[PDB]
Structures are given as C-alpha cells and as structure tokens.
Nucleic acid binder design. Structure first.
Ligand SMILES: CO[C@H]1[C@@H](O)[C@H](O)[C@H](OC[C@@]23C[C@@H]4[C@H](C)CC[C@H]4[C@@]4(C=O)C[C@@H]2C[C@@H](C(C)C)[C@@]34C(=O)O)O[C@@H]1C
Lengths: 144, 67, 260, 60, 185, 211
RNA sequence: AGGAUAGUGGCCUACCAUGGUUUCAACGGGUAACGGGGAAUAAGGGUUCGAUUCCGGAGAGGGAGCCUGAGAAACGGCUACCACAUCCAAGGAAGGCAGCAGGCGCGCAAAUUACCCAAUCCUAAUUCAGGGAGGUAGUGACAAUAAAUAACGAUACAGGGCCCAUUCGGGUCUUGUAAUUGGAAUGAGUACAAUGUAAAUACCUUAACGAGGAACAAUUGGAGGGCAAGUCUGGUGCCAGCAGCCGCGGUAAUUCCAGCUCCAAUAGCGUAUAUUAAAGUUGUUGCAGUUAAAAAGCUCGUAGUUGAACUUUGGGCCCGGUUGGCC
C-alpha cells in the first residue's frame, strides 16, 4: 500500500510526483519563483538605504495601544514607498525628513513582528551613523 | 638559530655563481645606479615611440620651433 | 584555447613529482620531447627536489648551461627537458651516474648506477613499421626511431640501446614468464613476472602478473614494460625492488630504523 | 481605528528619566581570572543556600 | 592565483546553548584548570569527537582490521608520549572512557603548578608568559600545549628569566640602582 | 572632545599646475598644494595637523553672506535620491551655498546673489544630478496668533455627543514665547522648578505656573 | 554526386525521396544557469550552493569580417557598422581596464594610482633581459589557529584542624577579605643591534626603558517563559517604549528608562537577509487522506509501474585455505 509506487523501475514517477508536490512549500515556491527578486522591496537583499520622506504615527494593534513612530522611507534602489520602524526610545527626534537611513529586515522574512501593522523594516543607521550609537550618544548625526 | 650555509672555494668564483643581492650584502659588489622599477619602465615606454636614434626629429623640431 | 599552453601552474602537475604547494604558484611545464609530460620528470625538479643539488631554478639552470649535466649522452641544457622513464644521467664531476626509474610508490626513484652499465638504455617498441624506400623501423617509448630492426622484432617488445650509437644491442620478445615493469595505474612502478596474457580483442588487452613475494594482480597492456627474465633483469633495481608490500611492515621498517 | 497618532510625545521617558551616574567601582579581574571568581562565587561564598543557590538573590 | 591554504576550525558548539546540567559541568572543569574560555573545552571535545568518531565507526570492524591497529597503537603512542593515556590499558575502549580532564591536565600550565615554582596557576602561566618558564631549553608559552611527558625532566624557570638566573628584573634594577641617588644628600 | 576629528592619511599629494595633475611624494611647508582622498569626510573646509595641541584655524567670514533663497524640488518622485545626495555634493564645492530645509519640507539652497545661484544650478542639471530639477521661489512659513482674549468661551461636543470641554484663548508674551524657544522654560525642567523661576521672571501667578 | 575543409559530415550546392523527434516530456518558455572537481550542512538517506585558488568553455562595449601566423575569427592585431568618448589649429586624428593599482556611478556590499623580479614559473637569439604572470609589504574583526586583561604577602575571622571540634586572644601550615599597606615578575608598547629581507616593515632575539586604579581600566547581548541569570532600588503610568513568539506597560513593571547585582560567549559578541539541520513540515529511507487539508462521482482505458508457479536437487569421494589447552 502506502499509495506510492514502490516498484523497482518506478523512479521516474517518484521524482515527478515529488517534484510536483514540492510546489506546496512556502520557501521552495518563493525560491523557485524568485518572489524576493521580483516582488519584494529588497531585491533579495538584507539592507537598503533610502530617504526619510515623512514621519508616520503608526497606531499599534490590539491588545496593545501605542504610537510606533515609523518613517515613510522610499528606497533609492527601486523607489518603493515602504514604511520603516524606528527602534529605541526617541530616535524620531534624531531623524527628520530628507535624511538618508539604512534599513534592515524586521526579523521575520516579511510578516511584520509585534504589534506593528504593515511595517516590515527597521532603521539601523542614519546619516551613515548607527542609530544604536546615536541612542547611546556616542556619536552625533551630522547635519549633512 | 638555525639556517643554511654555503662555502665557495675562491673569492674570484664567489662573485661568479652567487646571487647578486648577496654580492652587495657582503660588500663584494656595489648596488648599481638604477632608478625605481616604475621609472625605468616609463623610460623604455617613451623610448618605444621613437623609431631609432630619434636625433633627426630632435634637430627637426628645433628648426620648426625657430619661426 | 587559441593554441598550446605554455604555463603549467601548480596543482596541475603530475602528483608523483611531489611539488610543494607553498613554494610557488606555478610548476615547471615539461617541454616537448621523448616522454609525455604526465610520465616525465623535468630536469629542474630532478636536480632540485629529488637531489637538492641546487637551491632553486637559477642554480639548476646554472648547472645545465655549463654543460655539466648530460642525459642519455647529450648535454640538454634545458631546465625543463622532459626526462621520463629509464633516462640515464651523467655527471662529469662527482663521477655520478643517475637513472630515472619508478620505485614501488609510483614516483621516480633516485636510483644510482655505475658508468659501465650506465652507458646503455632500454626502450619498448611502441610500433613497428617501414619508412620511405621500405626501410623497417621501430619506435621506442622515448621516441628513439630505430632503423633496420631485427625481423624477429614485434610490437611491445623491449630493445636495449647502446646510447653511444643509436643501435639495438639485444631485444626481448613479449614472452610469458618474463619480468615486466608496470608504468600505469595503481600498479604503477610494480616490477613483476608475467603470469599469462589475455587478448580481449577490440583494444586494451589484459595482462596477469605475479610479484616476487607472490602478490598477484592484473593490469592493461600499454602500461607494461618487459625488463627481462626472472632473476636476470637487464638493469639494477631500486631499494624495495617493486615488491608492493602491505601497509603494515613499513611501520616495522620505519620503527626498526630509528626507533628500534 | 484612529490613524492620527501624535509625534510630539517621542522620547518622553528617556528625556524625563531621573538622571543617574554610573558608580565608580573597582575594576574586575576579567578572563580566566573572571572565571575563577565566578567559580568561587558559585562554590565558595554561596551567600544564599536556601533550597537552591539564587545566583541573583534579592536583598531580604 | 595562490594555491589555497587549507584551514579548518578546531572547535564545535553545543546544539543547546543554555543548559543548566551542561554549563555548570564544564564550568567545573574550566574552574579546575582555569580555561580562559570554553572554546578550549570545545576544541578538546571537538578533537575528542573527531578522535572517537574513528573508533565509533571502527569498533564496528573486527579485531583483525589492519586499519584498527594501523592507527590505534600509534594514537596510544601519542597518548602515552603525551600522557593523556598512561602506558598501561592500551585498548581503545579506554579512549572512549577518556574524559577531557586528561587533556586538561596534560596542558602545560596544569603540569607546571603540579611541580610548583608557582604557588598558584595564577602565577604559573604569567611566569609562562612573562618570559620565566622553559619547557626544555626553550620557552613554550601556551598552557594547552599537551606535554609529551619528556620535559618533566626539562621544565624549570626560564634560564633567561631572573628566576632562572642572570637577570635582576626591571623593578629590582629600578629600585636597587636608584638607592644610590636616594641615599641622601 | 572627540568631535569631528578624523584620523586618516593623505591618499596622494598632487601639485596643481593648471588643469594638469601629478602625484608628489613630499611637499615642503609654505607651498600651494592639492590633496586627495580626504574630502569625503572633510566638510569643504578644515585644518590638517599631526599633533593634538592645535585648536582650529578661524572660520572664514565668507565676505558675502548667502543672501538669496530658492526652493528646489524634483519633477518626478523616483528622482528624489539622485540630487538630495548631490545637493550636499554642491555644498561641498562652494564655500557659501548653504543647503537646508524649509518648514513645509522643501530644500533651500542659499546663493550669494542672483548671478551665483544660476551658476551653482547648471551643474544640478548636467553635473551633479543630470535629471532636471525645477526652480521654485521659497515659501516662507507664517505663524498665526491672537491678542483679543476671545469673549465667547470656546466649547465643543465630543463625537459621542456626551462630553463637553470649555476653552478660552489668550496671547502669550513674546519674551515668554522667546524664553520657551531659547530653552529657559522646558518640559524637562520639572513642574515645581519651572513654575517658580518664571513666576517672578515674567508676571504670572503661582497657580498658572504650576498648571 | 560534387564543392569546401586539415579532414568527417547537409558543412554547402544540384537531383532524388518523405523523412526526423515526441507523454520514457520532444518543442517552446524561465533561469535571480558558465560546467565539473568541490563548498555548507550532514546518523543514514539527502538538501542547498558551486561568480570564486584546479580542469574545461565563452568573452574582451555589441554584432560582423579578416591579415600575419604552426597555432587567432586575436582584440595591451586590424577594418567596418552601432553606443560611448577623447584631443583639436574644425582640416582631421586617435580608442577599448571582464589585466594590475586607482579613480564618476550602482549598491547592503568589497583594498595601494606602494616595493621587487628576491622566490615559482614562462618567453626570448635566450646563463645575464623581461614579466602588475607571480611574490613582498600596506589596508583587512571575510574566515581560521594559539592565547593578554595580572600573580605573593593578611584585612574585623565571618571554616574539621588544635587542649578529643576548648573561650575559635594558638600561625585554623588551607579558603574566603573594607579603592588600607610592601617585595619579586613581565608583556603590550618604545628602541639602540643583529637579522629576517631584493630592500625593508613584522615574527622569532635582544640593549635600555615600560604598571598600582597595574587610568596600560573588555566588550557584546540578556535576567517573565523559550533560555542562563532579579519580583533588587529609582522613574513612567496602555504614554514612552520593550517584545524573533507568547506577552509587559492603566501609580508596587521580576519584561519599559535607568543604577546595582547576576548571567552568557568572550577579543569577540549581536542584528538583517539567504540557506542547511531541526523538518518524518516534501516523505526512497520516511508523512497524511472517515472526521483535522486531502480518495477523483463511477467505470473503461493507452503509455507507465507491477505481475502466480514450474526447469540439476541431493548424495558420496578427493584436493586443498583453521580456532582451540596434545610446540
Ligand atoms: C543657518 O541657516 C539658517 C539661517 O540662515 C537663518 O536662521 C535662516 O532663517 C530663514 C528662516 C528661519 C526661520 C526659523 C528657523 C523658523 C521658520 C524659518 C523661516 C521660514 O519661514 C523664516 C526665516 C526665513 C525662512 C526661509 C529661508 C524659507 C526661514 C527658514 O529657514 O525656513 O534659516 C537658515 C536655515
């Protein structure tokens, strides 16, 4: 039984059957269709620069209640108008519009984490200087 | 300290079958008048242009610089 | 690619040379000559690695150009001359006569020899034909065109060369029970006696060999090379005499030497 | 839901937090020596042994 | 270009990074031999995994295996030359019984304190690294060097050291000599 | 402090002979020289030293101030990055074109006059950002204000039609407004410490300062 | 059948005939495809990657043509067209960094317009010349190896020693100790000197100097659970923020901001993306299909896969490769 051809010369059916059923994956379908390269703000990248155009007060999801202080960053490499989270306390006073910031993934290969609706990125640097360092006041963001 | 040793039979032959850098090392020979590798590369390049002695153009350009 | 290569960079050289990975980027490419570059040992590696007679390439080169080294009676000032199997070397100083033969381990043994029997060489008949004006000729494996061979000769036989004149002294037919030297495969360098032969027509004949200590095996036919008859090889053999003993007694052979 | 969240509140708690200074404390043997003192503080001066060694036992 | 230079990491990591049963257990060893970290007690365990992997897939093979004694006796020879396994009990079951304190004890700075001159492993390896230890006639300066049981007759203060003789050290120079100006007016 | 102190090395030394260029190993003191590989952190002006004792040389008075204002924007949304990086590139060249934002968010570049602005803008069409830019007159921000003490007390209905809050709007003194912006009166300063210092500094009661 | 080729051949030309491949996937499309040796992971089976140290191919902006030559459809050879661009006296001319350095760009993303043929080799008329091939050094937390950040003296005695553990005023010959007190010990570094080295810079060595806070000062992350470590102090009050997931935050927050303490790995440690294991969540090994997603409405049926049994078995003798306690 077992509903699979166990015959000794059934290798062709086994491979064809397995090769069709591999499409029911999520990772394999993404890799084979190249949905990261085709339909994704990052062209299969990990980080991407951009310009802060405005600031968004992103009201969180339930059961939480908070303003998430995201920034509408448009990515230089493809122009996509994406929203980037701004970690750490303050750090929205540290950045303003028409800055340049380095974005990174948000930890979940898409699928925004936490209580943040529709924001799948977090800002790492700003003005070429780490936002982590700015939060600790080690460096100073140049006015450039 | 552990190294390598080589003894030659004669000073006259010592200058013969010895690598040239040991020659100036032991003071047997003097480091010849030579520029850096880049500059001595450039001079052969600019010498590659002129087809021979190049003196004929040298005296030629002077008369065309006259007027 | 647009023509024959001139650089044979390291990690592409035959492994039996035992070149050093860190000692350089390239390896000495054996120029054209009697031996294919796979089974050939260039002079530079011979005189710098197998002997340490020279520090490096320039010293090997310094030796050859004073015409101090000669191979097969000819000086051959080339640093990368394709010296291969059964190639005799003569040195005016040191009164030293070398010869290039495989040891049991498939690499060229540093087998020294004496002037009297160093004067001659051995070759294997690669093919027998007859050239212009119907003059018969055989070709030894080192490309020694030998005109007017004895009619008893055949292909794959082995002939001894005076090396003073390009003359055959004596020849050996491919007869069973005759010691053969293997020059190919896992049996490379194994001297042993023909057990029998099997044709297996269509190409790539099969040959059966029994080692001196009764270690049987089988190999191709194009990798064998007759050296004579059991007990009378026509050349001296290196230490170990092609016995291909096991992997255990070298523990014994090595510990007994220094560690007792 | 409401979408007009306020930007004028960012950094409030960090801004208004009661400022404190890092205490001046003796420099610590670090490395293998730190492992000795860590081995020691776990097997010589086990201050609180009540049931199980509380590695950070609250003051009480 | 360059022929590649072979290199391979010599340490592994636990699959579970944070286990109370494990962490403290090797901490006992790192607190019994003063390991500067636990990359040491991995690099031994990873080597111990690589060594005992061969036994793991060779105990599958019979006792007439050429390969078995081909490397088994020789590895024990290393173990008895170094000492991690004593001259007796020359069967590879004992190796599978070997615990890393073997290697941890056969570290130099472990042996040096056992033959004193240090009063502590705190001083043993600073004496090693402050240029005051000689394994033979040479200053081996690494605690986890795996002594081959031969420098126990050669280990001592470094002959170049003040403690091995011929030098007074910087501080004894800087104060004994400075007394002359400091003797008064 | 450790501010704006880049520790690098002169990538190459070039002596300016017209438009030509040529490397130089050593250039002695008191000479006109050109240096490369250091501007990418340099802010169009600075001092180079090899010991820590030195303070900075005085800033240049610019002779002429950057008087004219012009607000530049972009024809296409996707073309914002190309110049905004190159708009700093411009400020690196001329020692007086200041580049900043306005209050509504449009970039402002300040030339030294009607002639200077055009020259420093031909490049922004061909040199620094080939994609064309549009010249717009600057928008100046205004503040609204009241000084009438609204008679009808303000009052509103919460969208649930239940709650009610009454309001009245009064002017605030400019000095009070100034001292807010200057940092005298802050949210950081606590309600007790802020209330007293201004209760006498600018005429208000105790309560409103506390409130 | 000829022509062409170095030769074979629809390679081309003429004539002749209707052949060729295909559900065992032809053809067409995609490739974020140069192939392989290999790399990562790895119980086994495998999965993913393989531009990249070797072999092979292709290219020299894109096609195309060709001379020389043994070897080229070459490009650090040429000609033309297309794109770009350079100098200009405007008439013209001269180009190809996917060679080594470097520079305008693109981007998350990548080093010196350094030294030298000293070594490995290669070429040449060829010992000598050349070689950005290669090597040396600079930058380099790609990655990997080893291991500095520190010991000796006793700090209220807050430990079996002891006169049988007594009074812990006695060396309680060993462990813990209030930024208290002194003696050896050096490296990191600096530097004569040799040297390594083509030459040096370094290593290894060494003069001499170089520690008290040894300010020559270790960080990176965490302390609710997963998961090692706080219900400790202060602030905030569903705000700020944290939180990979659950969740914390509404005036007593073990989760926020801090400070202390404690963990963890440690000169490294996090984070992001991708991938392997975990994943027996791709399944041959090895899943599930009554209800959780899933048995085609049912039957026929070609390719496929699979396909009952039966055919010289057995018995003797001989030769000759073994362990054990009858060497
Ligand atoms: C150093 O650079 C400074 C100074 O030059 C000066 O403060 C100058 O003043 C210009 C204005 C400054 C005002 C304040 C900063 C707040 C509002 C700003 C203005 C907008 O309406 C008023 C004047 C003129 C404006 C115009 C320019 C749109 C300002 C501006 O910068 O936007 O601004 C620049 C940025």
């Amino acid at each position: 039984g077992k509903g699979k051809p166990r015959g000794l010369n059934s290798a062709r059916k086994l491979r064809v059957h397995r090769r069709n059923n591999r499409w029911a994956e999520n990772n394999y379908k993404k890799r084979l269709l190249g949905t990261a390269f085709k339909s994704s703000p990052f062209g299969g990248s990990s980080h991407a620069k951009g310009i802060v155009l405005e600031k968004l007060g992103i009201e969180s999801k339930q059961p939480n209640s908070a303003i998430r202080k995201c920034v509408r960053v448009q990515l230089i490499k493809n122009g996509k108008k994406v929203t980037a989270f701004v970690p750490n306390d303050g750090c929205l006073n540290f950045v303003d519009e028409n800055d340049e910031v380095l974005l990174a993934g948000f930890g979940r290969k898409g699928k925004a984490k936490g209580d943040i609706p529709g924001v799948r990125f977090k800002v790492v640097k700003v003005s070429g200087v780490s936002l982590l360092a700015l939060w600790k006041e080690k460096k100073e963001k140049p006015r450039s | 300290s552990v190294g390598f040793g080589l003894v030659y039979n004669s000073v006259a032959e010592a200058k013969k079958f010895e690598p040239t850098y040991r020659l100036v090392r032991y003071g047997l020979a003097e480091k010849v008048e030579k520029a850096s590798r880049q500059q001595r590369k450039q001079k052969k390049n600019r010498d590659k242009k002129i087809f021979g002695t190049g003196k004929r153009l040298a005296k030629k350009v002077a008369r065309r610089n006259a007027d | 690619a647009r023509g024959p290569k001139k650089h044979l960079k390291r990690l592409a050289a035959p492994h039996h040379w035992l070149l050093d990975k860190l000692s350089g980027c390239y390896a000495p490419r054996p120029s054209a000559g009697p031996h294919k570059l796979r089974e050939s040992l260039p002079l530079i590696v011979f005189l710098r690695n197998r002997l340490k007679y020279a520090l490096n390439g320039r010293e090997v080169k310094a030796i050859l150009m004073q015409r101090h080294v000669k191979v097969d009676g000819k000086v051959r000032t080339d640093t990368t001359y394709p010296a291969g199997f059964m190639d005799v070397i003569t040195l005016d100083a040191t009164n030293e006569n070398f010869r290039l033969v495989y040891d049991v381990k498939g690499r060229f043994a540093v087998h020294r020899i004496t002037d009297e029997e160093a004067s001659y060489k051995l070759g294997k008949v690669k093919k027998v034909q007859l050239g212009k004006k119907g003059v018969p000729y055989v070709v030894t494996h080192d490309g020694r065109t030998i005109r007017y061979p004895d009619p008893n000769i055949k292909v794959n036989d082995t002939v001894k060369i005076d090396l003073a004149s390009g003359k055959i002294t004596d020849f050996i037919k491919f007869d069973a029970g005759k010691l053969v030297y293997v020059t190919g495969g896992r049996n490379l360098g194994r001297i042993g006696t023909i057990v029998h032969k099997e044709r297996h027509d269509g190409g790539f004949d099969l040959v059966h060999i029994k080692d001196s200590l009764d270690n049987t095996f089988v190999t191709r036919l194009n990798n064998v090379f007759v050296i004579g008859e059991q007990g009378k090889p026509y050349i001296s053999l290196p230490k170990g005499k092609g016995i291909k003993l096991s992997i255990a007694e070298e523990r014994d052979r090595r510990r007994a030497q220094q560690g007792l | 839901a409401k979408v007009h969240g306020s930007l004028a509140r960012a950094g409030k708690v960090k801004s208004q937090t009661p400022k404190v200074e890092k205490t001046e404390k003796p420099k610590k043997p670090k490395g293998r020596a730190y492992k000795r003192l860590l081995y020691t503080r776990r097997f010589v001066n086990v201050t609180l042994v009540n049931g199980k060694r509380r590695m950070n036992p609250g003051p009480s | 270009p360059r022929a590649p230079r072979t290199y391979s990491k010599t340490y592994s990591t636990p699959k579970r990074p944070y286990e109370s049963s494990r962490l403290d257990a090797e901490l006992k060893l790192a607190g019994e031999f003063g390991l500067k970290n636990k990359k040491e007690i991995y690099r031994i365990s990873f080597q111990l995994s690589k060594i005992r992997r061969a036994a793991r897939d060779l105990l599958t093979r019979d006792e007439k295996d050429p390969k078995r004694l081909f490397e088994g006796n020789a590895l024990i020879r290393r173990l008895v030359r170094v000492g991690v396994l004593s001259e007796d009990k020359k069967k590879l079951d004992y190796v599978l019984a070997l615990k890393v304190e073997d290697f941890l004890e056969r570290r130099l700075q472990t042996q040096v304190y056992k033959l004193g001159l240090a009063k502590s492993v705190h001083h043993a390896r600073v004496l090693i690294t402050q240029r005051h230890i000689a394994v033979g006639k040479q200053i081996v300066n690494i605690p986890s060097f795996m002594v081959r049981l031969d420098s126990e007759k050669h280990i001592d203060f470094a002959p170049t050291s003040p403690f091995g003789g011929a030098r007074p050290g910087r501080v004894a120079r800087r104060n004994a000599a400075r007394k002359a100006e400091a003797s008064g007016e | 402090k450790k501010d704006d102190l880049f520790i690098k090395a002169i990538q190459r030394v070039v002596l300016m002979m017209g438009r030509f260029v040529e490397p130089i190993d050593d250039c002695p003191a008191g000479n006109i020289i050109g240096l490369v590989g250091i501007d990418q952190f340099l802010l169009k002006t600075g001092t180079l030293t090899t010991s820590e004792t030195a303070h900075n040389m005085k800033v240049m008075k610019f002779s002429v101030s950057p008087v004219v204002q012009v607000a530049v924007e972009v024809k296409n949304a996707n073309d914002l990055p190309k110049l905004v990086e190159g708009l700093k590139r411009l400020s690196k060249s001329d020692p007086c074109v200041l580049t900043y934002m306005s209050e509504s968010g449009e970039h402002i570049v300040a030339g030294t006059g009607e002639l200077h602005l055009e020259i420093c803008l031909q490049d922004l069409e061909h040199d620094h950002a080939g994609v064309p830019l549009k010249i717009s007159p600057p928008v100046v921000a205004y503040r609204e204000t009241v000084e009438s003490e609204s008679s009808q007390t303000a009052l509103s209905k919460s969208p649930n039609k239940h709650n009610r809050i009454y309001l009245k709007a009064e002017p605030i003194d400019e000095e009070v407004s100034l001292a807010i912006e200057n940092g005298i009166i802050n949210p950081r300063d606590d309600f007790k410490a802020r209330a007293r210092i201004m209760a006498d500094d600018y005429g208000w009661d105790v309560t409103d300062a506390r409130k």
